[PDB]
Design brief:
Thrombin, subunit H; 2 domains; 7-stranded antiparallel β-sheet; 6-stranded antiparallel barrel; about 30% strand; binds ligand 847; binds calcium ion; binds chloride ion; hydrolase; serine protease; short hydrogen bond
Length: about 220
């Protein structure tokens, strides 16, 4: 997260860290056994780390659970990143409490101007790499579809939306992929891509979760 602030320990209880010997992507806990992340974060050997604040120190509240299976959306296109969503089923259910809790899926899509909270352990530099130990937060609004398409002509599908600041300076970045975009207590987006990080007129692009609620429910119901 570039231009964000320290969230504060366990103030984002649905945030998870996907780990393979190091933190490589974020995710959101949606129930005690399932996590939603981005398809481009897929790899084998994933350990899901819940209740984290400092990812380099065991401070208490952490729950490390292996993923039993990862389900990348069948229509995921790695070239366009269209349908960049994946579901991860945990080997055992997580113990939910105040520090580890699930986030609700939306019942409707959000409008432009909605303010959302984006969090993660991704790079904090737009020009260089600096990875933080604790979780960073950023409040960002959803932009209009016209501003988004104007910024990324020909690259935005109906399953994506832009959120951020056209002036640059505040944005999600590499390492934040797969993490949550929460607006009014509902998971509306998944950190997906962007051109560089926090560049002027190049806002972040997110997977539009409201387009996938039935798919998520049907897939969880059959696995
Ligand atoms: N500007 C943003 N809002 C943004 C958001 C998520 C991103 N995720 C990534 C991302 C980038 C890589 C690098 C690979 C590298 O430099 O080593 C790449 O360009 O392909 C890899 C992953 Br996986 C990302 O999620 N860039 C991102 C940029
Ligand atoms: Ca820790
Ligand atoms: Cl277009």
């Amino acid at each position: 997260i570039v231009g964000g602030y320290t969230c504060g320990a366990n103030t984002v209880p649905y945030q998870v860290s996907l780990n393979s010997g190091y933190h490589f992507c974020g995710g959101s806990l949606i129930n005690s056994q399932w996590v939603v992340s981005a398809a481009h974060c897929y790899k084998s050997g994933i350990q899901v780390r819940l209740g984290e604040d400092n990812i380099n120190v065991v401070e208490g509240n952490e729950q490390f659970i292996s993923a039993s299976k990862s389900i990348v959306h069948p229509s995921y296109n790695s070239n366009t990143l269209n349908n960049d969503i994946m579901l991860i089923k945990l080997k055992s259910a997580a113990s939910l409490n105040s520090r580890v809790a699930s986030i609700s899926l939306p019942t409707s899509c959000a409008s432009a101007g909605t303010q959302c909270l984006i969090s993660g352990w991704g790079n904090t530099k737009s020009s260089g790499t600096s990875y933080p130990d604790v979780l960073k937060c950023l409040k960002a609004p959803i932009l209009s579809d016209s501003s988004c398409k104007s910024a990324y002509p020909g690259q935005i599908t109906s399953n994506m939306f832009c959120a951020g600041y056209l002036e640059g300076g505040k944005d999600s970045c590499q390492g934040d992929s797969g993490g949550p975009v929460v607006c009014s207590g509902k998971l509306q987006g998944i950190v997906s891509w962007g051109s560089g990080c926090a560049q002027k007129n190049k806002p972040g692009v997110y997977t539009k979760v409201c387009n996938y609620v039935s798919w998520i429910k049907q897939t969880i119901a059959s696995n």
